[PDB]
Amino acid sequence: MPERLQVYKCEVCGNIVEVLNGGIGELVCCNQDMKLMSENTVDAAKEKHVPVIEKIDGGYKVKVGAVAHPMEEKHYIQWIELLADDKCYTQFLKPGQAPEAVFLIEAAKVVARAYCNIHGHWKAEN
């Protein structure tokens, strides 16, 4: 049963969606259950995938990760998301760009998430 903020992927066609409103029905695509992309579950280099959160004037800077993650055509961070109270800010990225995002927001406690097309969903919090 889907819950707000969960990210699901169809392993067949590649559709990836985020839940805005939950419910009882299971998400399906290409004749199979969409996969719940649970954070920090994939066996990949943590130093390149776990977001690093830096407090800045008026907000936060998030970089993926402690060591810059590749931003190649076949391997890159597709987006970085910042979660704070009832806010969900997303910055989509492209190969060639730096694996980082800046968010102007007033929130003491935040959760940063990032998604690698190959290595999945990752998160960190301050």
Binding site residues, Ca ion, CB under 5 A = 90
Residues 56 and 82 sit within 8 Å (Cβ to Cβ): no
Contacts of 108 (CB under 8 A, 6+ apart): none
For residue 42, the minimal CB distance to Ca ion (Å) is 21
Which range touches Fe ion (CB under 5 A), out of 13-21, 51-59, 89-97, 101-109? 13-21
Whichever of 19 and 68 has its CB closer to a copy of itself, that residue is 19
Minimal CA–CA distance to 18: which of 99, 124, 115, 118?
A: 115
Residues making contact with a copy of itself (CB under 8 A): 2, 4, 7-10, 12-30, 58-59, 78-79, 86-94, 104-105, 115
Q: List, as residue ranges, the binding site for Fe cation.
A: 10, 13, 29-30, 49, 69, 75, 116, 119
For residue 22, the minimal CB distance to a copy of itself (Å) is 7
Task: Say if strands 7-9 and 35-36 run parallel, antiparallel, or are unpaired.
Answer: antiparallel
* Coil, helix or strand at residue 35: strand
Task: Say if strands 77-84 and 111-116 run parallel, antiparallel, or are unpaired.
Answer: antiparallel
- By CB under 5 A, the count of residues binding Fe ion is 10
